[PDB]
Amino acid sequence: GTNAAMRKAFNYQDTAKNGKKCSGCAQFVPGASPTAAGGCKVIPGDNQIAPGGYCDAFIVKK
């Protein structure tokens, strides 16, 4: 399932934005494997977050 509202609020996209992507973001909750879709701490109920996606809420992880 996806959280359409939130994805739209953050202008989520399935592709990276100039090297910026979910897999390198502090909010990402990775799936069972690298290429698996995961979750996001700020997009509740969404389990279709692509590791190579991106949104306005991105924050480089440490």
Annotated binding site for [4Fe-4S] cluster: 22, 25, 40, 55
- Please report, as a single letter, which amino acid is at residue 1: G
Tell me how far apart the alpha carbons of residues 4 and 60 are, in angstroms, rounded to a whole number. Answer: 23
Tell me how far apart the alpha carbons of residues 46 and 19 are, in angstroms, rounded to a whole number. Answer: 23
Residue 31: contacted member of ligand SF4, its own copies, none (CB under 5 to 8 Å, by partner type)? its own copies
Return the residue of 27, 30, 47, 48 that touches ligand SF4, per CB under 6 A: 27
Q: Where are the alpha helices (DSSP H) in 1-62?
A: 4-9
DSSP 18: T
22 lies in the site for ligand SF4, by CB under 6 A = yes
Residues that bind ligand SF4 (CB under 6 A): 10, 12, 22, 25, 27-28, 40, 42-43, 49, 53-55, 57-58
